[PDB]
Design a protein around this nucleic acid. Structure first.
Ligand SMILES: [Mg+2]
Length: 140
DNA sequence: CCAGCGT
DNA sequence: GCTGCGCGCTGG
DNA sequence: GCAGC
Protein backbone atom coordinates (compact mmCIF):
# COMPACT_ATOMS: atom_id res chain seq x y z
CA UNK A 1 0.00 0.00 0.00
CA UNK A 2 1.30 3.29 -1.10
CA UNK A 3 -1.05 6.19 -0.32
CA UNK A 4 -1.03 8.72 -3.19
CA UNK A 5 0.28 12.25 -3.12
CA UNK A 6 -2.59 14.77 -3.21
CA UNK A 7 -2.98 18.45 -4.13
CA UNK A 8 -3.55 19.03 -0.39
CA UNK A 9 0.02 18.04 0.57
CA UNK A 10 -0.77 16.35 3.89
CA UNK A 11 2.44 15.52 5.80
CA UNK A 12 1.15 11.99 6.34
CA UNK A 13 1.79 11.48 2.60
CA UNK A 14 5.52 11.53 3.24
CA UNK A 15 5.65 9.77 6.61
CA UNK A 16 3.58 6.67 6.01
CA UNK A 17 6.59 4.24 5.90
CA UNK A 18 7.21 4.83 9.59
CA UNK A 19 3.98 4.64 11.58
CA UNK A 20 5.60 6.08 14.72
CA UNK A 21 6.78 9.25 12.81
CA UNK A 22 3.35 9.58 11.15
CA UNK A 23 1.67 9.32 14.54
CA UNK A 24 4.14 11.81 16.15
CA UNK A 25 3.22 14.19 13.34
CA UNK A 26 -0.49 13.83 14.20
CA UNK A 27 0.37 14.84 17.79
CA UNK A 28 2.38 17.84 16.56
CA UNK A 29 -0.78 18.94 14.69
CA UNK A 30 -3.08 18.81 17.79
CA UNK A 31 -4.43 22.42 17.77
CA UNK A 32 -1.33 23.63 16.05
CA UNK A 33 -0.93 24.81 12.42
CA UNK A 34 1.17 22.78 10.00
CA UNK A 35 3.04 25.96 9.05
CA UNK A 36 4.66 25.96 12.50
CA UNK A 37 4.40 22.34 13.64
CA UNK A 38 6.00 20.65 10.63
CA UNK A 39 9.31 22.59 10.59
CA UNK A 40 9.67 21.76 14.34
CA UNK A 41 8.85 18.09 13.62
CA UNK A 42 11.97 17.76 11.55
CA UNK A 43 14.03 19.19 14.45
CA UNK A 44 12.38 16.79 16.84
CA UNK A 45 12.99 13.80 14.52
CA UNK A 46 16.69 14.72 14.16
CA UNK A 47 17.01 14.51 17.90
CA UNK A 48 14.51 11.67 18.64
CA UNK A 49 14.68 9.50 15.53
CA UNK A 50 12.70 6.54 16.94
CA UNK A 51 10.23 5.45 19.62
CA UNK A 52 13.16 3.64 21.23
CA UNK A 53 14.90 6.98 21.97
CA UNK A 54 11.81 9.00 22.73
CA UNK A 55 10.57 6.53 25.34
CA UNK A 56 13.81 7.12 27.34
CA UNK A 57 13.73 10.90 27.08
CA UNK A 58 13.02 13.35 29.93
CA UNK A 59 9.81 15.08 29.01
CA UNK A 60 11.20 18.38 30.28
CA UNK A 61 13.90 18.30 27.56
CA UNK A 62 11.25 17.54 24.91
CA UNK A 63 9.11 20.41 26.18
CA UNK A 64 12.01 22.87 25.67
CA UNK A 65 12.20 21.91 22.00
CA UNK A 66 8.39 22.29 21.64
CA UNK A 67 7.90 25.56 23.40
CA UNK A 68 7.10 27.64 20.32
CA UNK A 69 4.27 25.23 19.36
CA UNK A 70 2.46 25.63 22.64
CA UNK A 71 0.92 22.69 24.57
CA UNK A 72 4.58 21.89 25.32
CA UNK A 73 4.44 20.07 28.67
CA UNK A 74 1.24 18.21 27.72
CA UNK A 75 2.68 17.13 24.42
CA UNK A 76 6.15 16.29 25.74
CA UNK A 77 4.61 13.96 28.31
CA UNK A 78 2.30 12.50 25.71
CA UNK A 79 5.19 11.80 23.31
CA UNK A 80 7.26 9.96 25.87
CA UNK A 81 4.28 7.83 27.13
CA UNK A 82 2.95 7.19 23.58
CA UNK A 83 6.45 6.10 22.52
CA UNK A 84 6.71 3.70 25.52
CA UNK A 85 3.30 2.18 24.70
CA UNK A 86 3.93 1.94 20.99
CA UNK A 87 6.88 -0.39 21.75
CA UNK A 88 5.72 -2.21 24.87
CA UNK A 89 1.93 -2.65 24.72
CA UNK A 90 0.00 -5.05 22.50
CA UNK A 91 -2.07 -3.02 20.07
CA UNK A 92 -3.75 -3.44 16.73
CA UNK A 93 -4.78 0.18 16.16
CA UNK A 94 -2.95 3.20 17.60
CA UNK A 95 -6.08 4.70 19.22
CA UNK A 96 -5.43 2.02 21.86
CA UNK A 97 -2.35 4.05 22.77
CA UNK A 98 -2.18 7.11 25.05
CA UNK A 99 -2.12 10.36 23.04
CA UNK A 100 -3.73 9.08 19.79
CA UNK A 101 -7.45 9.52 19.17
CA UNK A 102 -9.74 9.22 16.19
CA UNK A 103 -7.77 11.74 14.13
CA UNK A 104 -4.45 9.89 14.56
CA UNK A 105 -6.21 6.55 14.22
CA UNK A 106 -7.94 7.59 11.02
CA UNK A 107 -4.65 8.87 9.69
CA UNK A 108 -2.95 5.51 10.45
CA UNK A 109 -5.83 3.61 8.75
CA UNK A 110 -5.67 5.61 5.55
CA UNK A 111 -1.88 6.01 5.31
CA UNK A 112 -0.07 3.10 7.09
CA UNK A 113 -2.52 0.29 6.32
CA UNK A 114 -4.92 -0.17 3.43
CA UNK A 115 -8.17 0.57 5.25
CA UNK A 116 -8.98 3.93 3.66
CA UNK A 117 -12.33 2.70 2.34
CA UNK A 118 -13.53 2.03 5.88
CA UNK A 119 -12.47 5.36 7.38
CA UNK A 120 -14.83 8.31 7.95
CA UNK A 121 -12.76 11.26 9.08
CA UNK A 122 -14.04 14.18 11.13
CA UNK A 123 -10.84 16.21 10.65
CA UNK A 124 -11.40 18.56 7.71
CA UNK A 125 -8.06 18.21 5.94
CA UNK A 126 -8.14 14.40 6.32
CA UNK A 127 -11.67 14.43 4.96
CA UNK A 128 -10.55 16.44 1.92
CA UNK A 129 -7.85 13.82 1.26
CA UNK A 130 -10.31 10.91 1.81
CA UNK A 131 -13.01 12.47 -0.51
CA UNK A 132 -10.32 13.04 -3.12
CA UNK A 133 -9.26 9.43 -2.88
CA UNK A 134 -12.82 8.21 -3.53
CA UNK A 135 -13.11 10.58 -6.42
CA UNK A 136 -9.81 9.57 -7.92
CA UNK A 137 -8.88 5.99 -6.94
CA UNK A 138 -9.85 4.46 -10.33
CA UNK A 139 -7.76 7.00 -12.18
CA UNK A 140 -5.06 5.98 -9.70
C1' DC B 1 -2.77 46.53 16.88
C1' DC B 2 -5.35 42.45 18.39
C1' DA B 3 -9.50 38.52 18.89
C1' DG B 4 -9.66 34.18 16.72
C1' DC B 5 -7.43 30.17 14.88
C1' DG B 6 -4.55 25.72 13.82
C1' DT B 7 -4.90 18.32 9.95
C1' DG C 1 -21.10 16.53 27.38
C1' DC C 2 -17.13 20.41 28.74
C1' DT C 3 -12.22 22.05 30.12
C1' DG C 4 -7.14 22.68 30.27
C1' DC C 5 -3.51 22.88 27.55
C1' DG C 6 -0.55 27.30 24.83
C1' DC C 7 2.21 29.18 21.23
C1' DG C 8 2.73 32.16 17.05
C1' DC C 9 0.13 32.91 12.95
C1' DT C 10 -3.47 35.12 10.56
C1' DG C 11 -5.13 39.19 8.60
C1' DG C 12 -8.90 42.86 9.03
C1' DG D 1 -6.77 17.09 19.13
C1' DC D 2 -6.63 14.63 23.14
C1' DA D 3 -7.25 12.94 27.92
C1' DG D 4 -9.42 13.76 31.98
C1' DC D 5 -13.42 14.74 34.17
MG1 LIG E 1 -5.74 6.63 22.63
Amino acid sequence: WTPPRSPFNLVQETLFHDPWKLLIATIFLNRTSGKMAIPVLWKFLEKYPSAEVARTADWRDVSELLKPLGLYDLRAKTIVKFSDEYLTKQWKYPIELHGIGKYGNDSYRIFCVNEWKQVHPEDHKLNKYHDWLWENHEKL
